[PDB]
Amino acid sequence: VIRGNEVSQIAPGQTGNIADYNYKLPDDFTGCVIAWNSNKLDSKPSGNY
Amino acid sequence: YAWNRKRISNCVADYSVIYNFAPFFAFKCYGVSPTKLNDLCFTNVYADSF
């Protein structure tokens, strides 16, 4: 689970915080990236931390 | 129509904090990598806000 704006960083060669220190993709990556909003399940009103 | 231009010069820029706090939905670079910005030297830096 990541932010809404961080979905561009789950790609080969991407510059980011989670790209460098959390999840790194190789340059020769083959496959598919699936991203979907999870506000209904992965959010809480006081803050889901 | 009257967009604001600010000149940035004679400073050392840490672009890492721009990433650290950021409501920037779109962060699109054309001629340079975002993570390499800390490793480069520049002149002619301008921020155009509108």
Curated annotation (Swiss-Prot), chain B:
Domain of life of the source:
Viruses
Q: What's this protein's function?
A: Attaches the virion to the cell membrane by interacting with host receptor, initiating the infection. The major receptor is host ACE2. When S2/S2' has been cleaved, binding to the receptor triggers direct fusion at the cell membrane. When S2/S2' has not been cleaved, binding to the receptor results in internalization of the virus by endocytosis using host TFRC and GRM2 and leading to fusion of the virion membrane with the host endosomal membrane. Alternatively, may use NRP1/NRP2 and integrin as entry receptors.
Subunit and partners: Binds to host ACE2. RBD also interacts with the N-linked glycan on 'Asn-90' of ACE2. Cleavage of S generates a polybasic C-terminal sequence on S1 that binds to host Neuropilin-1 (NRP1) and Neuropilin-2 (NRP2) receptors. Interacts with host integrin alpha-5/beta-1 (ITGA5:ITGB1) and with ACE2 in complex with integrin alpha-5/beta-1 (ITGA5:ITGB1). May interact via cytoplasmic c-terminus with M protein. May interact (via N-terminus) with host bilirubin and biliverdin, thereby preventing antibody binding to the SARS-CoV-2 spike NTD via an allosteric mechanism.
Q: What is this protein called?
A: Spike protein S1
| Source organism | Severe acute respiratory syndrome coronavirus 2 (2019-nCoV)
Name the gene behind this protein: S
